[PDB]
From Swiss-Prot:
Changing residue 164 to C: In AIS; loss of androgen binding. GO terms for biological process: androgen receptor signaling pathway; animal organ formation; cell-cell signaling; cellular response to estrogen stimulus; cellular response to steroid hormone stimulus; cellular response to testosterone stimulus; epithelial cell differentiation involved in prostate gland development; epithelial cell morphogenesis. Changing residue 227 to A/Q: Reduced transcription activation in the presence of androgen. Changing residue 176 to G: In prostate cancer. Changing residue 137 to R: In AIS; loss of transactivation. Changing residue 144 to N: In AIS and PAIS. This is Androgen receptor. It is linked to Androgen insensitivity syndrome: An X-linked recessive form of pseudohermaphroditism due end-organ resistance to androgen. Affected males have female external genitalia, female breast development, blind vagina, absent uterus and female adnexa, and abdominal or inguinal testes, despite a normal 46,XY karyotype. The record marks 50 as: Interaction with coactivator LXXL and FXXFY motifs. Changing residue 88 to T: In PAIS; 50% reduction in transactivation. In the absence of ligand, steroid hormone receptors are thought to be weakly associated with nuclear components; hormone binding greatly increases receptor affinity. The hormone-receptor complex appears to recognize discrete DNA sequences upstream of transcriptional start sites. Its main location: nucleus.
Length: 247
């Protein structure tokens, strides 16, 4: 189980937001903590991605672009799984010190997106998603959103993606003889994977609008994040960069 050994080994540890939970909730404070957390997380996502089997096959410029475009979806997926395993989807577990209840969901002005993410979180339970299916699916999300014009080396990307889809096949094929059971499983998962994109899209839009009026809402945006939102996210919202759906 070489492939799974590796994913397990590189899976990031706990990342805290540094939020002050002794202070009443406020839009500004919550979003400032979400931005800070996002920035702390990106550092880990980058290190994780670069340690993924075959990732260095990609062109240097494609590596970062791919990481920045898929960043949101990866987090959404992981956060959903964390919510599932930690609080049984009761609340959104962004971090041990940044857990959202309905009040915070409403206060953050990200209610609709939070509700979709909670539903995703419940999906891991309804579908009895295994810890290993989760790891492979999350890896697959890194190769699920590219520019319409293609990357420097599209072919190496396509190869990479194809090989990851196959590993997911393998984790499903294991302990499964009847093809009809595997085909049904593959359907549910690819179907689950597709659902992540629309959620990331909504967060992107929310994040973009917020950055534009940040100076009006007293919301602090970290250096790196701001750059990605202003340079990368617009490409996604304008359609130049799009996700790869299964269905
Ligand atoms: C509002 C923002 O701070 C924006 O930061 C991000 C951003 F600007 C991006 F372009 C991203 F791709 C991204 F993943 C961000 F978090 C945010 O969505 N933060 C955030 C922090 C943690 C998590 N998390 O732990 O999964 C999430 C998420 F993914 F929505 F749930 C968002």
């Amino acid at each position: 189980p070489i492939f799974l050994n590796v994913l397990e080994a590189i899976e990031p540890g706990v990342v805290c937001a540094g939020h002050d939970n002794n202070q009443p909730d406020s839009f500004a404070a919550l979003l400032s903590s979400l931005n800070e957390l996002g920035e702390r997380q990106l550092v880990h996502v980058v290190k994780w991605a670069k340690a993924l089997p075959g990732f260095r096959n990609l062109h240097v410029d494609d590596q970062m672009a791919v990481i920045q475009y898929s960043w949101m979806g990866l987090m959404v997926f992981a956060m959903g799984w964390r919510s599932f395993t930690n609080v049984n989807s009761r609340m959104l577990y962004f971090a041990p010190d940044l857990v959202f209840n309905e009040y915070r969901m409403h206060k953050s002005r990200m209610y609709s997106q939070c509700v979709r993410m909670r539903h995703l979180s419940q999906e891991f339970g309804w579908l009895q998603i295994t810890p290993q299916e989760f790891l492979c699916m999350k890896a697959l999300l890194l190769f699920s959103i590219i520019p319409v014009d293609g990357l420097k080396n599209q072919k190496f990307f396509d190869e990479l993606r194809m090989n990851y889809i196959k590993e997911l096949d393998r984790i499903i094929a294991c302990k499964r003889k009847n093809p009809t059971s595997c085909s049904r499983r593959f359907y549910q998962l690819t179907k689950l994977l597709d659902s992540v994109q629309p959620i990331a899209r909504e967060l992107h839009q929310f994040t973009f609008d917020l950055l534009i009026k940040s100076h009006m809402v007293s919301v602090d945006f970290p250096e790196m994040m701001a750059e990605i939102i202003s340079v990368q996210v617009p490409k996604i919202l304008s359609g130049k960069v799009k996700p790869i759906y299964f269905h």
